[PDB]
Design a protein around this ligand. Structure first.
Ligand code: CA
Ligand code: ZN
Length: 392
């Protein structure tokens, strides 16, 4: 039964856009419909965040914070100095002023959004020692995001999240492939990548880096310009955080909070070949992944990096082994779901037979009851007890 009234906030991965972008084709729902609307219609108050798809998780967390409570994004003076981008970014009105008033939220996150969600919780609770020390030593102001002490997040749910990275980043032509993925997602929205649309269509929100699509420029052209830009070549990027070493580095500091419930869902869309031990894409997997990414993910081994046979099963973009929670470089505890959702640990909800884009409706799958999936999840989050209790 309903034990809390916290609203749900949806958070995308290294692809994703606001509700008004992409001509109204939703990242959360895609060709299937509008997940936020379904949840709202069913009595579960739900909102959606839109942050930089290619930006580092740090940048995304700072963007998510401002978007939630309102104000100007503040990446931190120490962080900005370190990486060479603007300290202040876009200004937001704030989706949920209730937060500065003792309210809490449930975050449902897909792909890299699960890293961002985890990071946000960490900053909200503990702040950043490094930013605190820099502000004192340099006499600069400090965002509350870096002071700690907030209590805004009741739970975090991740879907198809590369908690331990994805080996997709290891492809020799990953740079070109990754942008082709962006192009494949545009195509699912019926948007061409060789047309210089005058409307925005898809904002990568690279305000901090000073990058934006220019007049007369197609997405193909823009992407060629981003591949050579700091959001692709620096360590302050989605690209780095998505890698196995980058994810490991993130796990070293982004820990599960004992005040928050964590739920993890894995996805897989492959079969094992009996002769090679490799994994192959199943019928129905999105075409781009089936041809360009799945074959690699299902066969790439690297002993020195610690990529073994456990990593071969995949959803076409992320290795399933990486999804149940952070493990590499992490102290977090992961427990298989046994009927009780516990606070401060990863509740492994299992593996679902869907692909990376099917789980959010971007790619069709008439056998996947997506409406039921999200409604069941919503009822579960609504049933979570704030401060529960011990018994026989
Ligand atoms: Ca499909
Ligand atoms: Zn940054």
């Amino acid at each position: 039964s309903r034990a809390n009234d916290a609203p749900i906030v949806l958070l995308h991965g290294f692809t994703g856009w606001g509700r008004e972008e992409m001509f109204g084709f939703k990242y959360w729902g895609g060709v299937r419909g509008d997940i936020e609307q379904w949840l709202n219609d069913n009595g579960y108050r739900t909102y959606t965040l839109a942050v930089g798809p290619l930006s580092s998780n740090w940048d995304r967390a700072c963007e998510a914070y401002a978007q939630l409570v309102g104000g100007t994004v503040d990446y931190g003076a120490a962080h900005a100095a370190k990486h060479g981008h603007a300290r202040f970014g876009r200004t937001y009105p704030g989706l949920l002023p209730e937060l500065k008033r003792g309210g809490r939220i449930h975050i449902i996150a897909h792909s890299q959004g699960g890293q961002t969600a985890r990071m946000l919780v960490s900053l909200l609770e503990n702040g950043s020692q490094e930013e605190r020390e820099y502000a004192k030593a340099h006499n600069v102001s400090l965002s509350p995001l870096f002071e700690g002490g907030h209590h805004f997040v009741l739970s975090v749910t991740t879907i198809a999240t590369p908690h331990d990275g994805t080996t997709l980043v290891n492809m020799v032509d990953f740079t070109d492939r990754f942008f082709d993925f962006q192009k494949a997602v545009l195509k699912a929205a019926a948007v061409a990548s060789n047309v210089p649309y005058t409307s925005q269509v898809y904002d990568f929100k690279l305000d901090q880096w000073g990058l934006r699509r220019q007049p007369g420029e197609s997405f193909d052209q823009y992407f060629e310009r981003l591949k050579r830009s700091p959001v692709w070549t620096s360590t302050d990027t989605a690209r780095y955080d998505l890698s196995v070493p980058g994810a490991e580095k993130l796990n070293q500091w982004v820990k599960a909070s004992p005040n928050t419930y964590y739920l993890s869902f894995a996805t897989e869309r492959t079969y094992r070949g009996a002769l090679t031990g490799n994994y192959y894409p199943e019928l129905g997997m999105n075409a781009f992944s089936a041809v360009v990414c799945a074959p690699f993910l299902g066969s790439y081994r690297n002993a020195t990096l610690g990529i073994d046979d456990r990593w071969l099963e995949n959803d076409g973009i992320v290795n399933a082994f990486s999804m149940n929670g952070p493990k590499r470089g992490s102290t977090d505890r992961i427990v298989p779901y046994d009927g009780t959702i516990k606070k401060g640990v990863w509740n492994d909800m299992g593996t679902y037979n869907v692909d990376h884009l099917e789980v959010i409706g971007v790619d069709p799958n008439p056998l996947f009851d997506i409406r039921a999936f999200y409604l069941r999840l919503a009822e579960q989050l609504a049933s979570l007890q704030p401060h529960h209790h011990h018994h026989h």
